[PDB]
A paper describes a structure:
Ornithine carbamoyltransferases (OTCs) are involved in the arginine deiminase (ADI) pathway and in arginine biosynthesis. Two OTCs in a pair are named catalytic OTC (cOTC) and anabolic OTC (aOTC). Structural and biochemical analyses were employed to investigate the CP cooperativity and unidirectional function of two sequentially similar OTCs (32.4% identity) named Ps_cOTC and Ps_aOTC from Psychrobacter sp. PAMC 21119. Here, we determined the Ps_cOTC and Ps_aOTC structures from the psychrophilic bacteria Psychrobacter sp. PAMC 21119 at 2.6 and 2.2 Å and compared them in respect to the substrate preferences for kinetic processes and cooperativity.
In contrast, aOTC catalyzes the biosynthesis of citrulline from CP and ornithine in vivo and is thus involved in arginine biosynthesis. Moreover, we determined the crystal structure of Ps_aOTC at a 2.2 Å resolution. Most of the amino acids were built, except for the SMG loop region (nine amino acids) between S8 and H10 because of ambiguous electron density. In detail, His131 from H6; Asn162 and Met163 from H7; the Cys259, Leu260, and Ala262 from the HCLP loop; and Arg55 from H3 are the main residues creating the potential binding cleft for the CP and ORN of Ps_aOTC. These residues are highly conserved among OTCs indicating that Ps_aOTC may have the catalytic characteristics of aOTCs. Three identical Ps_aOTC monomers are built from a cyclic homotrimer, which shows a similar quaternary structure as Ps_cOTC. In the Ps_aOTC structure, the 80s loop (81–LGRGEP–86) is leaning against the H5 of the B chain starting from the sharp turn of P86. Conversely, Ps_aOTC forms a potential binding cavity for CP. The clear CP and ORN binding sites provided by the lack of closed residues from the 80s loop in the Ps_aOTC probably allow the CP molecule to slip into the binding site. Ps_aOTC also exhibited thermal stability in concert with elevated CP concentrations but with a hyperbolic pattern.
Numbering used by the authors:
A (entry chain A), B (entry chain A), C (entry chain A): 2 to 223, 233 to 304
Write the structure that this text describes.
């Protein structure tokens, strides 16, 4: 019975498509001022082993809009140490709240937390995978261009940040991914091989962009010499499908800014990427607690 | 369309009078146990570049009573650095929440935040101006003595704390202000000149108090030699209008205490000054989001 | 009129029995998914002079389930310094919120806070007494075995942690307590004498366990040489009443773990002890604010 969201594949292809569609409907409802409160009396526990303000604000805002409450556990509040400290945090917190989101770095830590939880666990982000941001990215594409099935997606930059999430998503959402990575900054071959069905490595960014429906990048405006040809410009977007949309990993560290040209370009959906963390996560919480609804 | 509260004059004289009257009605409603929840599904973002527990508790309590939720962003949560860090915090937070209060020190920072916000901004307090406390002070006067229009207000102390807020309020609420400031601790002449229409500088505290309807002070009980004659006592209140009320800036730093004599004096409305941050801010949030109500 | 919960005896024997019974009914309601929201528009202020995550999560979750909001004041937010800083925090916070829980160490501090509060004060825990955990422990016993009146309770370990709370509870809930304390780690004689009516000191843990209905311990699995015979095992439980239940102080410091044998033993109610902080505190808040209900 008890379903978690630890990795993207914990939902079937159809559940993922229904979720993104549901997130778009929840976004229209909130903006139209509809009151939808299926979680009156319900509580979200938010466990942050490492801080993410974007995660925290979006989850807290979401559960509130649904009539529930969110409990913010900051790193040095509760014991996340491997062993009993982890498993006892899980059983006790889940006897009190109805759903838990966790931000940790152990991929084995989130699995152990889940095993001892009586309630659904959401893995918001780990150090390797960003499943909540990836859901928000797929919602944003869907809202501007419909279904991404059999579309072409071009990742521009290294194998860090959301690269692995996009590679993982290719198979699940049914798209073709090209990774345009600078020489010496390619993803792990072992990863490439895992997703070799849907994903290909392409040095030439101009060729990778050809016929792309979505261009997504973690390359920050100005190592810098090596990334300079991987800077996404209006010029690069001109080589894509005329229906191309542009996404950019949102700023994570000081100095990371996206050019005005790319934010203001009419093909850019960066601001929806950030807002849709709210709506995509509401769709996810609604899905995991649906047997508590109505 | 989009209206902010960055400075007192962002509301007309009549809106300010309606707001104070509305705050008094909201206070009676809450105390009578009336449930008034126009903000079900709505969120307040509270941005603190510098901490104010009094601001935080009052806003959080207010939005909660209205059926909404408040998100507490502490200083080193979100990026308030001048430039893009500021403007991107604004656009993204306002795509998710319905109203933002900000506590900063830049008067240019709150204006820039407002320019890029899709939602109303409340400037709770800056390092120079205390517009939320000033609304609570005007509510408190109104509740005990009615309209302050054509009344006499006497500020006793230096040009710090709420002095500039009172000088600014004189013109907007239509009162005459005397600043009774010790020699060498007078407000900036340039300020005095700005508000020279409604505001006068008066050394003799006894003369300043003559016919006063409200005496307000930032002079803390026992430099100290120089302030000693500017200590507000029952004696000084005896020289005012028999209807005079007494207010005192609330404690901001360790060691700042108000005498028992002044707190317990029947003309003292200090405790209402503190409580009415709750009600005045509810009136303000209701005003700025009224097109979302009903 | 105004009633506080500063110590267990602030409620009569019958109010305590009604509260534990009410907590059990509230637990069944929440688990059955009943919406019970008597505190729409109401606020809990949570003052932590010393941090307790277990207290914070349980209170915050409880007030939320009841439709209210909880304000989390962390140590260095508000001034708890003895004198005016304490009494002014009390009067102002209570003019805004409807109920306050306080975690302090002064037994004179919680009394002074209460004297100047216009609203009910809950003393969640002090450094000596754990009245909220003790209510959760009495709920847990009641749910598994009914009334504890005229039952035998055996405390195994030193005079720290919940020992004094159990000694205090003996008289109020009408049970007989044996303290099985290792030589040189007995409670204060002056305490023993205070509760000498209901409480006895018994060195031999085997004899103390004889006919016990509840065995409770703060002895942590492996000074250690001296506590080793005071380790509660399935063996020790075999010498008690066949209806015996086992409780254990919940972990407070790093290294404090309860054996798997004792957690998984069918007589162990440790997990209910932790969950019932939620339900017992809801029963308490409902009792203290009942004249605001319906």
């Amino acid at each position: 019975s008890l379903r978690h969201f630890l990795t993207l594949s914990d939902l079937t292809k159809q559940e993922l498509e229904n979720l993104i569609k549901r997130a778009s409907e929840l976004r229209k409802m909130q903006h139209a001022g509809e009151i939808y409160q299926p979680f009156v009396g319900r509580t979200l526990g938010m466990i942050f082993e490492k801080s993410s303000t974007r995660t925290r604000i979006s989850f807290e805002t979401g559960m509130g809009q649904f009539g529930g409450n969110a409990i913010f556990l900051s790193p040095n509040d509760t014991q996340l140490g491997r062993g009993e400290p982890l498993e006892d945090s899980a059983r006790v917190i889940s006897s009190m709240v109805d759903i838990i989101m966790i931000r940790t770095f152990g991929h084995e830590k989130v699995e152990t937390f889940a095993e001892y939880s009586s309630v659904p666990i959401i893995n918001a982000l780990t150090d390797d995978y960003h499943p909540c941001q990836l859901l928000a990215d797929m919602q944003t594409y869907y809202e501007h261009r419909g279904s991404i099935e059999n579309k072409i997606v071009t990742w521009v930059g290294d194998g860090n940040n959301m690269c692995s999430s996009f590679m993982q998503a290719a198979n699940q959402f049914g798209f073709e991914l090209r990774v345009a990575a600078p020489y010496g900054f390619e993803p792990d071959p072992k990863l490439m091989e895992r997703f070799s069905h849907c994903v290909s490595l392409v040095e030439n960014v101009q060729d990778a962009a050809k016929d792309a429906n979505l261009i997504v990048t973690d390359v920050w405006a100005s190592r810098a010499r090596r990334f300079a040809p991987y800077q996404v410009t209006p010029s690069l977007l001109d080589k894509a499908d005329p229906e191309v949309v542009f996404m950019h990993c949102l700023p994570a560290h000081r100095g990371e800014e996206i050019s005005h040209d790319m934010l203001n370009d009419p093909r850019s959906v960066v601001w929806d990427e950030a807002e849709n963390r709210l709506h995509a996560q509401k769709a996810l919480m609604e899905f995991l607690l649906k047997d508590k609804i109505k």
